[PDB]
């Protein structure tokens, strides 16, 4: 029953880890909603909602 060997997580890493760039879909209106709005908007013209 030894102590906790935190040999690696002792320090702090300063960088992020994943390096793939930030996608463009986090800086614009949620295009899944914009599709969702058009399903509701269409539904008004058919008069179901």
């Amino acid at each position: 029953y030894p102590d906790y060997d935190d040999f690696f997580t002792n320090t702090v890493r300063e960088t992020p880890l994943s390096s793939a760039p930030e996608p463009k879909r986090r800086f614009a209106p949620s295009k899944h909603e914009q599709k969702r709005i058009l399903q509701l908007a269409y539904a008004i013209r058919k008069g179901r909602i």
Binding site: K24, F27, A28, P29, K31
Partner: protein
């Protein structure tokens, strides 16, 4: 079989797309602020490029704008 495969692809050949009411106005608002040539800086427009469209995609609609 040559004739059936050409006249069918003669009336079903035009693939021009008229824009929607919004798609016309979205480009319309963009084109009156910087002109009709400098499409490459419209991916850096903060407000009116609210969809963050491409530098290429706006030209795709701009062809669909006129024809």
């Amino acid at each position: 079989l040559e004739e059936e495969a050409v006249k069918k692809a003669a009336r079903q050949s035009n693939k021009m797309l008229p824009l929607s009411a919004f798609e016309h106005a979205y480009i319309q608002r963009l084109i009156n602020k910087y002109g009709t040539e400098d499409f490459e800086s419209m991916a850096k427009d903060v407000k009116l490029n609210s969809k963050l469209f491409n530098g290429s995609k706006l030209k795709n609609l701009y062809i669909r704008m006129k024809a």
